[PDB]
Design a protein around this ligand. Structure first.
Ligand SMILES: Nc1ncnc2c1ncn2[C@@H]1O[C@H](C[C@@H](N)CC[C@H](N)C(=O)O)[C@@H](O)[C@H]1O
Ligand SMILES: Nc1ncnc2c1ncn2[C@@H]1O[C@H](C[C@@H](N)CC[C@H](N)C(=O)O)[C@@H](O)[C@H]1O
Lengths: 9, 343, 342
């Protein structure tokens, strides 16, 4: 996918 | 090479462009549960690293190698395919560890190591565990592993469980109903509404949720990283039979994963479950096209079939039925194109 | 073709994949300022469409071709390169306009039209106007345009202006200062400080803001689509000399754009200015790594340079200096990878 790792707060 | 055989060139470019950003490495690093647990697992099992030879598969910033160096590793080989390898090298020099940490730019299955290793460390887990297909690169690195050598982490459990989320389900048709109007600036858009619905259902939903939506104990599918081969992950059949703990409409399957670092001193767990504090992996949910009514006591059975593709991800095929009623549903989802909902 | 020469084919796959998704067509369509202004431009200038041959460059869902048909167009060639072309043809059938709208799948640089057209319509504007490089495809399409044929939109203005936003600057600075840590889980990251600042400030910031953050009257750079050649958008040089109206720290340059549909009945403007209602383009701000101090009455002079790249975007270089003190700021930004702050 485009951003394989998703952003964490 | 093996990687280039199974991976489209353009998928690979984009993939290593992504991990080439310091901001993305940072995002992973500041996941305290992730980075903290990895450090804790490496240091508490100091006997596994003391004066040993280590391989870091996809070192990124080098963080995990530095944790190995903190535990007393003699030599640590740090492999990284993206341009992050340059930045990793800068940190090795600046932390006075050029003698102990060696940084090798290139893909783990294309580069050559001087020597074999006692233990391999990596963080290759994507969301729903398998996304990115880095587990295969991890398993492939056992060609450099000495016999009786260890893997950190050593196993991975993917968990599946049925959920009820009536609002998540209905939201899909709310969004798609944009197209159901006879005069959008004079244009009848309604012929595309069905196509819009199909599009939204193809997306797994990456976010977290209250555990109260879960209708049964999870079923786990285990991968032992010491035993498994690359080929085991080309087609992953996960059968399930849920003993339903609650009654209601089942709208899909919720996914998460844990991994274990089985060391000599102790066994440390890194969990991404919805009962634990949030990680950057969140959790993943795949909706059924049609909900299924289930009673507490019933058995909801079926298969989650993950078929690997050359875009470093999987086509998800989910089939499920309530055994007592015959009522059944399915869906086809695209793991590489998830809807990020906790945004 | 002219397209594949300037475009890395990996970038082209992504780009047209993105526009194959109905959700993304919906996103543009729901921008009522965008869609409503386009419809108004076409319907209010109905004489420029009545019984005319039209080209719609990158029709997507076909929405603009339907407006051209509403305004009395005889024939409309709706060119679209993504798989959205399929869905457009479905809508042409379901709306009973098979006799008037003709979907032509393919890249506008590659397809063949059976005749020349009286007017080209399109919506090729990206962030900062120029991102995506679709203006070149729009200009390229003039090879199908009859002598004295019209372009909708006809012209495009890019506005740039200096701004002060302490909170924005610090937000990005704080992110980059993660890499200033001497002991992140026992590890010294501080050697990567500079690289981190470089990386973060390479990202343009896409969101909206209050106009009070602007410290000078904006500079306007105009592209006339009737005149411009697609080669004119490979290297865009925009010199600026701002007369500062407020004293304070200049944290960067803010960008927006307007386009004008110059028709035979009236001229209609679509603006993405911070003074105007919000569009899906928002506005774009390019941060300096270190802000420049300026007094009211000073002149901030320099050059914004847009160099087209092969990932359908631009590498932005902004050199700026305060003339009174000689305080100087050089910056390189990657328009392809912006930070969506909103
Ligand atoms: N086949 C491969 N060969 C070498 N490196 C890879 C490969 N596949 C993925 N990677 C890298 O592995 C890293 C995976 C990260 N999740 C781990 C980063 C770092 N080790 C950390 O724990 O913070 C990314 O930086 C990728 O660029
Ligand atoms: N070179 C090209 N040839 C054909 N179509 C293109 C090209 N470049 C971009 N496009 C398409 O142009 C569309 C750009 C959209 N902003 C416009 C959509 C639609 N015309 C609307 O006004 O809603 C996308 O659907 C792209 O796929």
């Amino acid at each position: 996918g485009k951003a394989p790792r998703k952003q964490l707060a | 090479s093996v990687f280039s055989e199974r991976t489209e060139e353009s998928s690979a470019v984009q993939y290593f462009q992504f991990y080439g950003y310091l901001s993305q490495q940072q995002n992973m690093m500041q996941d305290y549960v992730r980075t903290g647990t990895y450090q804790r697992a490496i240091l508490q099992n100091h006997t596994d690293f003391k004066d040993k030879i280590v391989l870091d598969v996809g070192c990124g910033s080098g963080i995990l190698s530095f944790f190995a160096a903190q535990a007393g590793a003699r030599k640590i080989y740090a492999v990284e395919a993206s341009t992050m390898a340059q930045h990793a090298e800068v940190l090795v020099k600046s932390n006075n560890l050029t003698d102990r940490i060696v940084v090798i730019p290139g893909k783990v299955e294309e580069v050559s190591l001087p020597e074999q290793v006692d233990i391999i460390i990596s963080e290759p887990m994507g969301y729903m565990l398998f996304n990115e297909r880095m587990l295969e690169s991890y398993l492939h690195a056992k060609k450099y592993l000495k016999p009786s050598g260890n893997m950190f982490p050593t196993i991975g459990d993917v968990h599946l469980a049925p959920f009820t989320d009536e609002q998540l389900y209905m939201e899909q048709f709310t969004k798609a109903n944009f197209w159901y109007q006879p005069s959008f600036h004079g244009v009848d858009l309604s012929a595309l509404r069905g196509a819009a619905v199909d599009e939204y259902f193809r997306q797994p939903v990456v976010d977290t949720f209250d555990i109260r939506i879960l209708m049964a104990k999870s079923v786990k599918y285990t991968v032992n990283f010491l035993e498994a081969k690359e080929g085991d992950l080309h087609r992953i059949e996960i059968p399930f039979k849920f003993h339903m703990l609650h009654s209601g409409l089942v709208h899909g399957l919720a996914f998460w994963f844990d991994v274990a670092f089985i060391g000599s001193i102790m066994t440390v767990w890194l969990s991404t479950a919805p009962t634990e504090p949030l990680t950057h992996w969140y959790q993943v949910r795949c909706l059924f096209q049609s909900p299924l009514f289930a009673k507490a006591g019933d058995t909801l059975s079926g298969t989650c079939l993950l078929i690997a593709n050359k875009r470093q991800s999987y086509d998800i095929s989910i089939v499920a039925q309530v055994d007592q009623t015959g009522s059944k549903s399915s869906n086809l989802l695209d793991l590489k194109n998830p809807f990020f909902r906790y945004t």
